[PDB]
Chain length 250, copies 4
């Protein structure tokens, strides 16, 4: 029987590449998505064409609210429903936008989105994963630039720091159950869609190793390692995949 | 005129010692409290006996909710209404209790309390402090053991990691306004009074420097340094006040 | 055709496991040794029996001295002479013993061995490797307990901290040359042969992940990942392989 | 009776500022120097004119060699000879120059100077200070940019990382003796004398807090705090004094 993985925010970009690589490794996959229904369904079709009954989609908003625990329980439940097991959780989904401290969304909505997607949903997904329970593990998508943050991104940065805390606390608490918990911390990978070309090139030029952003596949490679049998003694570790970017001074 | 400071969770323990030392240094103080009204008022009365019209109290729940931004705006406003200025914000208030990942508050109440008091309220207070604006600074009460956490304290640890992120992000963003943002990270300080001495001693014996916990006054001393003229180039720094505890392996 | 790797201290324990695994992956190997000639030659015999002329030995003392730069140049040169190329350098050799601050070898001998083997030899080897130059990389064997050090191990700890600095500095400086530089940080792996069984078990019980030390092969697996095509965007990263030990408070 | 302090590299710049501020606080001081004899004697003369018999000079090369332990023992002995006690050691002296990995002094001379002054001399001074033994403490001058290093400064950066390790290891080991060990980590403070103004301004513009380097007095203020009674529970802490520089991404 093939193991099964949940990947959040898996319709596009890094999450898609993670879901593809897990599937290529032998996993059955739950493709979680929020708005990107067409892309999620299209990915599941492509994976199922390769091996039937190995991919399903699961829609959920990961914004914090009093129903977020139920949504997170449902995502894990969807994996058990489709595949009878859940071996791997990848917390990839993320909201990312500025929240300046000095002055259409209310600040409480920004808190719910940025802290919910980046930290609270990973926590609740981790609880549900552990409670519903080989080679079990969780991989959190962190941020290599967490200590040299983007100006005016305080709530985003707070959420990603909270995710480091979750990675460490859950590694400690879940180790006696044989569940490893680790992180992968990109520097600059696939650049935002809204961003212009001259700006993208500015960021590319900062990266010591090759003066280019990471491909989604390069990020997924670190995820694959961490869920593999080659990482069985690794827990609580966060692997930077940043081309040296976090080493570069102002 | 005398400068003014807001101290959250100032009725008892570390926040009380901070408020007293700031007052002794010459600050007028807003004593924020949640449940401890008698203690808050007793402190205000003691400080006003020392110097008239130098202390007020401000009640607020710092749990996350739709009204938290308004509450935090009101806390800052209370300092301006009482004293005509707000020079110092000390984010001291904190909820602290276990939240195990594996199995009478709901998990979302625990999120609201632990992430709200430890991280979101500091963020909203920081926004309101900056918007309302010399030696201006913010001091956040962090935790020296954030990377070697208590078992089953994931939400607490997430909140304290988020607070490190806020300290760094806000230092960067507020530096152009001349507002410094720093942290003080206790190891073991005041223990619960109801905790058996035999249990308190297990903690005390872990501390390399003197085999004792920090007094509240020793924590307050680092706060006083950070708000002083002797720290005018210090921003984004977190000072451990832990007797070497964080250096001790398992 | 086949790439080539230098592994220092490769005759026994972790270095041996690294050498075996690199060989199994298709590398030709230089097995460096200081005192363990018999063991080095026995390993080379084993590897050459598998694939002829794919393993050579190289003697050198890695103690700091006037001749250490020449010795390090020779180690790198041996790889180029045997195999025509040098793709991977693994700085694994180490000295480990206490150096109490409050009171055999003179203290300056301890400096030469602890700082020399653990930090200066890696620096000189890195220089020689880079000067003599595809998937090129260096892997430094670090220590996951670097910030929670063993009592009375100051010089050892200083050396391992220096090695973190070299990993980061060399990653930055060598990135333009396409040379990646990373670390693997064991917690408790193969215990010193001198250490008694009760002391071994005492350390084992502290590890969250299965209450056991890492095998040498688990350490080697992380090295294999970092030198692989799956790590081509990773530079300046140190992967802990410690079963969660560094997360455990006193 | 007045307490006494040793400051290494105290003839000029930050070391002079530390010596002056310690003297103004009421310490008797040993002004260590290497080449700057006129400047050292001039400073001691100024201090002795303020309060007679409160300053002496002590010449020593802190480059690593087989006599460095005796030199470090002598610096400490000079404080006992002059003043009958030694309460504070400030490890300020430092060599700083590039050591490129890819191509006057031999590499072994560069190792001896950069690792000797920045790490081994602090280690040997720490040993002699502890063995010769109230409010006793050691303060090490570290570097806030240790994890975002200057290009081609590997040996310097290895030495400052080793000094972090010493700070932590010595804090742990000397805590039972009541000796606190801490660090102060400048970002950019007094720019090199040989640096032209245009290059100085490039660095100044990077600093979030005021777009200027730290004054020597600002660095000394943090040293004064760490030696004071207001830091009596602080050990193993490194206080950044960097105006937010280390938080600024590439
Ligand atoms: N890209 C980089 O350079 C970079 C750098 C550092 C860290 N990272 C981290 O790596 C991960 C992947 O990066 P990425 O650039 O691929 O991410 P992304 O494109 O910004 O976001 C990934 C997905 O997150 C989902 N998402 C957003 N808000 C959500 C909500 N309220 N509920 C549920 N899902 C939501 C979206 O799903 P739908 O499209 O279905 O709505 C989105 O496609 C993220 O955790 C990110 O923080 C990336
Ligand atoms: N004590 C230690 O050993 C230690 C160790 C590490 C870190 N720290 C940090 O140092 C700081 C002070 O420690 P402490 O031991 O003095 O803290 P504490 O006694 O646990 O709590 C301080 C105050 O926080 C306020 N608070 C709690 N929940 C609140 C809510 N929902 N809304 C508003 N206020 C709330 C309470 O005020 P009322 O009483 O008025 O309700 C309480 O008296 C905290 O940030 C803590 O995390 C302490
Ligand atoms: N084992 C662990 O639990 C652990 C934990 C943390 C970090 N590490 C790190 O992982 C790496 C490997 O650990 P290990 O336990 O396998 O190491 P080890 O057995 O202590 O030493 C490995 C080899 O280093 C060589 N070596 C020592 N001093 C030398 C000198 N002056 N000149 C030349 N070579 C010298 C020796 O080679 P010869 O026998 O040929 O003389 C020795 O066999 C080390 O860097 C270590 O610091 C290990
Ligand atoms: N300046 C900055 O921006 C900055 C930034 C980060 C860290 N720091 C750290 O802060 C401390 C003070 O900085 P600084 O700029 O004032 O230092 P500095 O001027 O570069 O050096 C201070 C003194 O070190 C002594 N020294 C150098 N080589 C020596 C040797 N072989 N033996 C004995 N003494 C030697 C010299 O004494 P003589 O003149 O008597 O020969 C020199 O005056 C240093 O530890 C430095 O690394 C400074
Ligand atoms: N461009 C970046 O550095 C960056 C950082 C974080 C991040 N998180 C996302 N969800 S997209 C994204 C982009
Ligand atoms: N005993 C401790 O180490 C500890 C840590 C954090 C904390 N936060 C509070 N609000 S009380 C408290 C106690
Ligand atoms: N017992 C350990 O945890 C340990 C730590 C470091 C180390 N370095 C060596 N060369 S052997 C060794 C063992
Ligand atoms: N320019 C700097 O940031 C800088 C850094 C370190 C340092 N160390 C010295 N001895 S002078 C000096 C200057």
């Amino acid at each position: 029987e093939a193991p099964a993985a949940v990947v959040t925010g898996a319709a596009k970009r890094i999450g898609r590449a993670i879901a593809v690589k897990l599937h290529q490794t032998g996993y059955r996959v739950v493709i979680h998505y929020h708005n990107s229904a067409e892309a999620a369904v299209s990915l599941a079709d492509e994976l199922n064409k390769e091996r039937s009954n190995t991919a399903v989609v699961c829609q959920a908003d990961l914004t914090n609210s009093n129903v977020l625990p139920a949504s997170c329980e449902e995502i894990i439940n969807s994996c058990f429903r489709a595949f009878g097991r859940c071996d791997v959780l990848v917390n990839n989904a993320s909201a990312f936008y500025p929240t300046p401290l000095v002055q259409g969304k209310t600040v409480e909505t920004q808190v719910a989105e940025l802290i919910g997607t980046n930290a609270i949903a990973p926590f609740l997904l981790t609880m549900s994963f552990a409670q519903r329970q080989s080679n079990l593990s969780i991989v959190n998508l962190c941020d290599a630039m967490v200590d040299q943050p983007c100006m005016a991104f305080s709530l985003y940065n707070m959420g990603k720091h909270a995710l480091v805390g979750l990675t460490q606390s859950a590694a400690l608490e879940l180790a006696p159950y044989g569940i490893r918990v680790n992180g992968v911390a990109p520097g600059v990978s696939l650049l935002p869609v809204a961003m212009g070309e001259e700006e993208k090139d500015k960021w590319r030029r900062k990266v010591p190793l090759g003066r280019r952003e990471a491909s989604a596949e390069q990020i997924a490679d670190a995820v694959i390692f961490l869920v593999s049998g080659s990482a069985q003694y690794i827990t609580g570790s966060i692997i930077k995949v940043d081309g040296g970017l976090s080493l570069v001074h102002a």
